[PDB]
Structures are given as structure tokens and as C-alpha cells.
Design a protein around this motif. Structure first.
Motif, PDB file in Angstrom:
ATOM      1  N   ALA A 229     -65.184 -13.674 -83.516  1.00 14.62           N
ATOM      2  CA  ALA A 229     -64.504 -14.425 -83.883  1.00 14.62           C
ATOM      3  C   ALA A 229     -64.374 -15.524 -82.995  1.00 14.62           C
ATOM      4  O   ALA A 229     -63.886 -15.240 -81.795  1.00 14.62           O
ATOM      5  CB  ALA A 229     -62.745 -14.212 -84.239  1.00 14.62           C
ATOM      6  N   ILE A 230     -64.849 -16.710 -83.561  1.00 17.41           N
ATOM      7  CA  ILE A 230     -65.281 -17.878 -82.600  1.00 17.41           C
ATOM      8  C   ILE A 230     -64.263 -19.133 -83.452  1.00 17.41           C
ATOM      9  O   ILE A 230     -64.625 -19.290 -84.468  1.00 17.41           O
ATOM     10  CB  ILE A 230     -66.685 -18.531 -82.627  1.00 17.41           C
ATOM     11  N   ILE A 231     -63.226 -19.664 -82.917  1.00 17.78           N
ATOM     12  CA  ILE A 231     -62.040 -20.351 -83.461  1.00 17.78           C
ATOM     13  C   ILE A 231     -61.994 -21.712 -82.611  1.00 17.78           C
ATOM     14  O   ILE A 231     -61.515 -21.669 -81.517  1.00 17.78           O
ATOM     15  CB  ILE A 231     -60.809 -19.619 -83.632  1.00 17.78           C
ATOM     16  N   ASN A 232     -62.177 -22.774 -83.575  1.00 18.15           N
ATOM     17  CA  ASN A 232     -61.675 -23.917 -83.035  1.00 18.15           C
ATOM     18  C   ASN A 232     -60.178 -24.039 -82.658  1.00 18.15           C
ATOM     19  O   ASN A 232     -59.281 -24.065 -83.704  1.00 18.15           O
ATOM     20  CB  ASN A 232     -62.060 -25.164 -83.954  1.00 18.15           C
ATOM     21  N   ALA A 233     -59.705 -24.239 -81.599  1.00 19.03           N
ATOM     22  CA  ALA A 233     -58.329 -24.514 -80.926  1.00 19.03           C
ATOM     23  C   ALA A 233     -57.781 -25.721 -81.324  1.00 19.03           C
ATOM     24  O   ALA A 233     -56.491 -25.913 -80.968  1.00 19.03           O
ATOM     25  CB  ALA A 233     -58.144 -23.819 -79.583  1.00 19.03           C
ATOM     26  N   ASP A 234     -58.655 -26.742 -81.518  1.00 16.62           N
ATOM     27  CA  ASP A 234     -58.257 -28.109 -81.782  1.00 16.62           C
ATOM     28  C   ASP A 234     -57.360 -28.306 -83.376  1.00 16.62           C
ATOM     29  O   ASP A 234     -56.826 -29.194 -83.623  1.00 16.62           O
ATOM     30  CB  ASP A 234     -59.198 -29.197 -81.680  1.00 16.62           C
ATOM     31  N   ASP A 235     -57.461 -27.025 -84.012  1.00 18.00           N
ATOM     32  CA  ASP A 235     -56.913 -27.006 -85.305  1.00 18.00           C
ATOM     33  C   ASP A 235     -55.352 -26.163 -85.135  1.00 18.00           C
ATOM     34  O   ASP A 235     -55.722 -25.001 -84.421  1.00 18.00           O
ATOM     35  CB  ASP A 235     -57.955 -26.129 -86.128  1.00 18.00           C
ATOM     36  N   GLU A 236     -54.402 -26.693 -85.605  1.00 18.02           N
ATOM     37  CA  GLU A 236     -52.982 -25.977 -85.651  1.00 18.02           C
ATOM     38  C   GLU A 236     -53.044 -24.769 -86.130  1.00 18.02           C
ATOM     39  O   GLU A 236     -52.459 -23.792 -85.248  1.00 18.02           O
ATOM     40  CB  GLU A 236     -52.084 -26.902 -86.420  1.00 18.02           C
ATOM     41  N   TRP A 241     -53.826 -18.285 -85.103  1.00 15.31           N
ATOM     42  CA  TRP A 241     -54.689 -17.136 -85.167  1.00 15.31           C
ATOM     43  C   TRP A 241     -55.126 -16.609 -83.882  1.00 15.31           C
ATOM     44  O   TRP A 241     -55.226 -15.629 -83.547  1.00 15.31           O
ATOM     45  CB  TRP A 241     -55.715 -17.495 -86.267  1.00 15.31           C
ATOM     46  N   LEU A 242     -55.635 -17.565 -83.023  1.00 12.93           N
ATOM     47  CA  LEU A 242     -56.172 -17.127 -81.593  1.00 12.93           C
ATOM     48  C   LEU A 242     -54.915 -16.628 -80.859  1.00 12.93           C
ATOM     49  O   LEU A 242     -55.137 -15.496 -79.861  1.00 12.93           O
ATOM     50  CB  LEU A 242     -56.540 -18.379 -80.779  1.00 12.93           C
ATOM     51  N   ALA A 250     -61.673 -18.854 -77.924  1.00 11.32           N
ATOM     52  CA  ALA A 250     -61.062 -20.228 -78.128  1.00 11.32           C
ATOM     53  C   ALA A 250     -61.967 -21.296 -77.734  1.00 11.32           C
ATOM     54  O   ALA A 250     -62.304 -21.246 -76.596  1.00 11.32           O
ATOM     55  CB  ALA A 250     -59.796 -20.215 -77.274  1.00 11.32           C
ATOM     56  N   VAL A 251     -62.081 -22.371 -78.529  1.00 11.48           N
ATOM     57  CA  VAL A 251     -62.880 -23.535 -78.277  1.00 11.48           C
ATOM     58  C   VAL A 251     -62.204 -24.517 -78.579  1.00 11.48           C
ATOM     59  O   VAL A 251     -61.538 -24.860 -79.360  1.00 11.48           O
ATOM     60  CB  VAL A 251     -64.367 -23.243 -79.324  1.00 11.48           C
ATOM     61  N   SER A 252     -62.234 -25.543 -77.349  1.00 12.96           N
ATOM     62  CA  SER A 252     -61.513 -26.919 -77.493  1.00 12.96           C
ATOM     63  C   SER A 252     -62.338 -28.108 -76.701  1.00 12.96           C
ATOM     64  O   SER A 252     -63.218 -27.726 -75.849  1.00 12.96           O
ATOM     65  CB  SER A 252     -60.227 -26.639 -76.814  1.00 12.96           C
ATOM     66  N   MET A 253     -62.049 -29.108 -77.355  1.00 11.10           N
ATOM     67  CA  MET A 253     -62.476 -30.378 -76.678  1.00 11.10           C
ATOM     68  C   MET A 253     -61.331 -31.312 -76.429  1.00 11.10           C
ATOM     69  O   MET A 253     -61.423 -32.649 -76.120  1.00 11.10           O
ATOM     70  CB  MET A 253     -63.565 -31.040 -77.046  1.00 11.10           C
ATOM     71  N   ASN A 260     -53.403 -18.584 -69.724  1.00  6.77           N
ATOM     72  CA  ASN A 260     -52.765 -17.639 -69.153  1.00  6.77           C
ATOM     73  C   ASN A 260     -52.856 -16.159 -70.032  1.00  6.77           C
ATOM     74  O   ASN A 260     -52.463 -15.271 -69.445  1.00  6.77           O
ATOM     75  CB  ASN A 260     -51.246 -17.729 -69.620  1.00  6.77           C
ATOM     76  N   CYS A 261     -53.632 -16.327 -71.085  1.00  7.91           N
ATOM     77  CA  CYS A 261     -54.038 -15.228 -72.045  1.00  7.91           C
ATOM     78  C   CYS A 261     -55.275 -14.592 -71.507  1.00  7.91           C
ATOM     79  O   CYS A 261     -55.333 -13.370 -72.026  1.00  7.91           O
ATOM     80  CB  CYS A 261     -54.269 -15.923 -73.625  1.00  7.91           C
ATOM     81  N   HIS A 262     -56.004 -15.010 -70.638  1.00  5.81           N
ATOM     82  CA  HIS A 262     -57.054 -14.324 -70.165  1.00  5.81           C
ATOM     83  C   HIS A 262     -58.070 -13.847 -71.144  1.00  5.81           C
ATOM     84  O   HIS A 262     -58.888 -12.860 -70.835  1.00  5.81           O
ATOM     85  CB  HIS A 262     -56.519 -12.895 -69.161  1.00  5.81           C
ATOM     86  N   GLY A 263     -58.155 -14.589 -72.138  1.00  4.74           N
ATOM     87  CA  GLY A 263     -59.403 -14.383 -73.160  1.00  4.74           C
ATOM     88  C   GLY A 263     -60.440 -14.955 -73.010  1.00  4.74           C
ATOM     89  O   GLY A 263     -60.614 -15.871 -71.979  1.00  4.74           O
ATOM     90  N   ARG A 264     -61.484 -15.099 -73.776  1.00  3.03           N
ATOM     91  CA  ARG A 264     -63.004 -15.861 -73.676  1.00  3.03           C
ATOM     92  C   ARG A 264     -62.456 -16.945 -74.260  1.00  3.03           C
ATOM     93  O   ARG A 264     -61.666 -17.533 -75.406  1.00  3.03           O
ATOM     94  CB  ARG A 264     -63.734 -15.118 -74.518  1.00  3.03           C
ATOM     95  N   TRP A 265     -62.975 -18.274 -73.622  1.00  9.16           N
ATOM     96  CA  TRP A 265     -62.988 -19.474 -74.150  1.00  9.16           C
ATOM     97  C   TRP A 265     -63.924 -20.493 -73.597  1.00  9.16           C
ATOM     98  O   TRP A 265     -64.900 -20.040 -72.687  1.00  9.16           O
ATOM     99  CB  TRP A 265     -61.557 -20.105 -73.367  1.00  9.16           C
ATOM    100  N   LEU A 266     -64.196 -21.636 -74.192  1.00  6.64           N
ATOM    101  CA  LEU A 266     -65.093 -22.647 -73.900  1.00  6.64           C
ATOM    102  C   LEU A 266     -64.321 -23.992 -74.105  1.00  6.64           C
ATOM    103  O   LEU A 266     -63.981 -23.936 -75.511  1.00  6.64           O
ATOM    104  CB  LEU A 266     -66.392 -22.513 -74.734  1.00  6.64           C
ATOM    105  N   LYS A 267     -64.400 -24.882 -73.219  1.00 15.57           N
ATOM    106  CA  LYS A 267     -63.870 -26.198 -73.428  1.00 15.57           C
ATOM    107  C   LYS A 267     -64.538 -27.161 -72.913  1.00 15.57           C
ATOM    108  O   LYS A 267     -65.076 -27.055 -71.419  1.00 15.57           O
ATOM    109  CB  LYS A 267     -62.288 -26.243 -73.212  1.00 15.57           C
ATOM    110  N   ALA A 268     -64.869 -28.341 -73.512  1.00 14.88           N
ATOM    111  CA  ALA A 268     -65.613 -29.627 -72.877  1.00 14.88           C
ATOM    112  C   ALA A 268     -64.131 -30.245 -72.088  1.00 14.88           C
ATOM    113  O   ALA A 268     -63.054 -30.331 -72.534  1.00 14.88           O
ATOM    114  CB  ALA A 268     -65.396 -30.582 -74.003  1.00 14.88           C
TER     115      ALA A 268
END
Length: 487
Positions: A229-236, A241-242, A250-253, A260-268
Motif C-alpha cells: 500500500a502506497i498512500i498519499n499522506a497529504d490526504d486527511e 489509514w497510514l 507514506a508519501v508527502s510533499m 516517529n512511526c519508523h515506517g517506510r516513507w518518501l517526501k519532497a
């Protein structure tokens, strides 16, 4: 394809029959086919069992509801008729098995959400192919191998996917509609990854309604093989869900990653929007980097980041993804940029509604150091309502509005232009130039080097309808020729 093998998981010792094609439509059911008789919206395919038999189908699978027990094997005119309960729910699985599990024989990525679905799907297919896949898309535009997209039930989904497997596809990016998901159209697909561009929806301001919405969707997704699951974190809703999905990415710009969650993430971390695209600096649990995107606007940064995070999650090496990013191209007719040394930047976009024109101008603005020009018109002999609204939008969100013709058809071209101007506070400040080619030329030749010219309304729709004649004309070709480049 044999009926007995087909049904083995559900109905032991079903009769042996060679099967040709699987169809829900009795009208095309032919000699050797498997006819599937389902109950839908005010429809019952069981009505057509006699017709299908008369047409020489090899076998029938039919909804059991009110007529038979689950797995009941009957025989009509020598033809096996096998009844199954909840057939709509099982149709995907049945078709999957019929077509030899196409989603088990390529890497399938599902993309869901209201915005960015088409672009994200295309970027996934494009990028994977640059990395060595033979990639395909399934979407509303159409289905096919990349660059060969041909312009819908659970059976069709599986059939089409099997077709792509046969053509040698190793990767498929599929747009999944909300409605399709609810109707069990992808129920049995093995998704390697699922991309959620957003999860929010309008009309859910009541807490009770949001709760029900989330519950219904969570239930649905819990029944599917979603893969990563690849989820846009800029959505409420995406963020909520994340918090429940520790293996989701978690994906964000817009700074919505919680380290703190130590999960996988990618952010601009920063984006420089310039004439030819965007320089995107990002951090991620796979490492950090910089991408030179040739796509325009903030939304396309998000779409690119979702594609990147997805491919990283699937195990494509960051280094190879970075090496290929500069070859990612815009979706046909969608915020397509044309640059040339010492000339204005020109963007060709299909926008032909108020909302689309506003979005296009907002996107173009980000890349515009100087003045933003907007060249557009409205279709003749169509609803006139949009005309003043598009006028108002061009005036508000652009610095120079150049109002011209766009498929006037049999309507007086200047009348259409007047309707557009009627919507402006200061019509006198707009430029009017008729001959679309002339209007485009006016903007391009007068705009400064650091200006951006948005040419809206057509995209890759390469004609101008004047009277009853579809005249050869292309915004892309006109722009390229003016800039001394190749469309």
C-alpha cells in the motif's frame, strides 16, 4: 480451458467440456462458449439460458439465487448448467481461473482515488518500462502496451489482462474506479501494489457519514489482495489509514510524514518549479535524491512521487529510478511543455472547462517568472454556460488573456468570443485574435523569454472544426514550429 478444471476449486466432478470464450452476453454467446448468467440492475441473464443453448454454447454457469443450491449441477438439452450462489462476487475469481490467472503472471499495480489516477498510472508504466519491463496500462482512456493503447465487467478485466500477458506485458498499471471496486470487478486480482492518490470524498461532513464511508471502503480493501500500500499522506483520510497500516508507504510533499512511526516513507523536501519542469529534492527510507521532472505543476510532483515510492516498494533500485526519471514524459495533451533557447515557455493543455482552465493556469504560474499568457476559446454549438466563467478564470489567473476560436462549428465565431468577454471585469484588457493559429502566434512572438504561454482547449485533439469542416490544425505543431522545435 475445460469446465471441469475451471470449477474444480468450487464444484467437484463438474462435467468435462472444452470451452472457447467466456461471456455474460447471450447475444454473442457462440458454439463452444461458456455463457455466464448473472443477475444485475433490473436484469437476469438466466432468462437467456434457452437462447444460449440454441446458439450451441458448451456450458452455462448461473446465479443460484431462488433457483438452485450452490454447486448444483443440472443438464438442459445435453448442456451442463451449473449454479453458484453470490455469482457477482465470485465472477472475478471464476474469470481469473478461466484466463490462467493473468495477474499472477505480470506485476499488477492498482491506482485508486479521484485525482491523479490517470497520470500516476501512466508514470508507473513509463518508468517500469524504462527499467526493463514491457509495460501496459488499463484505464478509462483505454488498454494496451505502452504507446499502443486501444480506446466493463469482472470477465472483461480478466480477459483484457490475459490479452496483455499474451502480448508479452510484464507490468501493468491499472486505474481502478470506485464503482468498479464496489461491483467486485477486480475482486480476484493479485495486486503487487495499490496506490491511493487520495481517500477523501465530498459530501461526508457528517462524522457518521465519514465513519460509514471509511468502514465500507476498509471492508472492501480488506477483501482484496492489495499488496504493498502506497498512500498519499497529504490526504486527511490517507493519514488516518497510514496510522493503522504499519507496512504502508507514506508519501508527502507538504510535510505530513511522522518520523516517529519508523515506517517506510518518501517526501519532497523542496521543489524548484522552472521553465522546463521541476527539480524535486526528496528524502526517503530508501535514501535521498534529486529528480529533474519534465512534468508541470504541483499535482504532477505528487503523481511522480507516488510512482517513485511504489517502484521503490516493489524493489526497483533507487539509482536506476533516478537515472531514468528525466525520460518520464507528460500524458498526451496534458500540461505538455515546449521550451526553446531564448523563447517563452509554452504549455499545451486540453483544459476546456472553468475548473480545468483554472487548474492549468495555477500549475503554469508556478513555472512562470515573468507574465502568464492564456490563449483559449470555446466550442461553438455546445452549451454556452461555461463561456463567461472561462473568461473570468483567464482574467483572474493569467496576466494576459488572448481570446480566440476553438471549434466554432456553425456558430458565429465572434459571438462565442463576446460570450467569453461578457464574463470579464475588464474585457478591454483581453486581446482578441481570430484565427487560432494567429492568436497562438501573437502570444508566442510577443511573450518575453521568462513568460509562460498556456495554449488551452485542445491538447492533442489535432483539428479545428469550422462550419462542417474538420480542418487539419494542431496547437502542438503550431507551437513547435514557432519555437523551432519538433512536436
Amino acid at each position: 480451458r475445460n469446465l471441469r478444471d475451471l470449477l474444480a476449486p468450487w464444484v467437484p466432478d463438474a462435467p468435462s467440456r472444452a470451452l472457447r470464450e467466456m461471456t455474460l452476453d447471450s447475444r454473442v454467446a457462440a458454439a463452444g462458449d461458456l455463457f455466464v448468467a448473472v443477475v444485475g440492475h433490473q436484469a437476469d441473464g438466466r432468462r437467456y439460458i434457452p437462447q444460449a443453448i440454441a446458439q450451441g454454447v458448451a456450458a452455462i454457469i448461473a446465479e443460484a439465487k431462488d433457483e438452485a443450491t450452490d454447486g448444483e449441477i443440472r443438464e438442459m438439452h445435453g448442456v451442463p448448467v451449473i449454479y453458484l450462489s453470490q455469482l457477482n462476487e465470485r465472477l472475478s475469481a471464476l474469470a481469473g481461473r478461466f484466463y490462467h490467472e493473468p495477474s499472477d503472471n505480470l506485476r499488477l499495480v492498482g491506482v485508486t482515488g479521484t485525482n491523479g489516477k490517470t497520470t500516476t498510472t501512466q508514470l508507473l508504466a513509463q518508468w517500469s518500462q524504462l527499467l526493463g519491463e514491457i509495460s501496459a496500462v488499463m484505464g478509462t482512456v483505454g488498454n494496451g502496451l505502452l504507446g499502443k493503447v486501444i480506446p466493463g465487467s469482472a470477465v472483461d478485466v480478466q480477459h483484457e489482462l490475459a490479452g496483455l500477458v499474451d502480448q508479452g506485458a510484464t507490468f501493468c498499471a491499472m486505474e481502478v474506479s470506485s464503482h468498479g471496486l464496489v461491483q467486485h470487478r477486480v475482486a480476484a486480482l493479485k495486486f503487487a501494489a495499490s496506490v491511493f492518490t487520495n481517500l477523501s470524498r465530498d459530501h461526508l461532513d457528517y462524522h457518521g457519514d465519514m465513519e460509514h464511508y471509511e468502514a465500507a471502503k476498509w471492508l472492501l480493501y480488506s477483501e482484496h489482495h492489495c499488496g504493498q500500500a502506497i498512500i498519499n499522506a497529504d490526504d486527511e483520510v490517507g493519514r488516518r489509514w497510514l496510522a493503522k497500516l504499519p507496512d504502508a508507504v507514506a508519501v508527502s510533499m507538504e510535510d505530513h510524514i511522522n518520523p516517529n512511526c519508523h515506517g517506510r516513507w518518501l517526501k519532497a523536501t523542496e521543489v524548484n518549479y522552472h521553465d522546463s519542469g521541476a527539480t524535486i529534492r526528496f528524502s526517503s527510507s530508501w535514501g535521498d535524491g534529486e529528480i529533474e521532472s519534465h512534468l508541470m505543476g504541483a499535482f504532477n510532483v505528487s503523481n511522480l512521487l507516488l510512482a517513485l515510492a511504489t517502484l521503490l516498494a516493489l524493489g526497483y533500485p533507487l539509482a536506476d529510478l533516478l537515472k531514468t526519471a528525466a525520460r518520464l514524459q507528460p500524458v498526451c495533451g496534458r500540461m505538455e511543455v515546449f521550451t526553446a533557447p531564448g523563447k517563452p515557455t509554452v504549455v499545451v493543455d486540453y483544459a476546456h472547462t472553468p475548473d480545468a482552465l483554472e487548474k492549468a493556469l495555477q500549475a503554469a504560474r508556478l513555472h512562470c517568472a515573468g507574465k502568464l499568457w492564456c490563449v483559449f476559446g470555446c466550442g461553438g454549438d455546445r452549451d454556452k454556460g461555461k463561456r463567461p466563467l472561462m473568461g473570468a478564470i483567464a482574467e483572474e489567473f493569467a496576466d494576459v488573456a488572448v481570446v480566440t476560436d476553438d471549434n466554432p462549428r456553425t456558430e458565429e465565431p465572434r459571438a462565442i468570443i463576446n460570450d467569453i468577454l461578457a464574463g470579464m471585469l475588464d474585457a478591454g484588457h483581453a486581446k482578441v485574435m481570430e484565427g487560432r493559429a494567429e492568436a497562438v502566434t501573437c502570444a508566442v512572438m510577443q511573450a518575453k523569454e521568462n513568460d509562460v504561454v498556456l495554449v488551452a482547449g485542445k491538447g492533442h485533439e489535432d483539428y479545428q472544426i469550422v462550419g462542417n469542416q474538420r480542418l487539419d490544425y494542431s496547437d502542438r505543431v503550431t507551437v513547435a514550429r514557432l519555437l523551432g522545435v519538433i512536436a
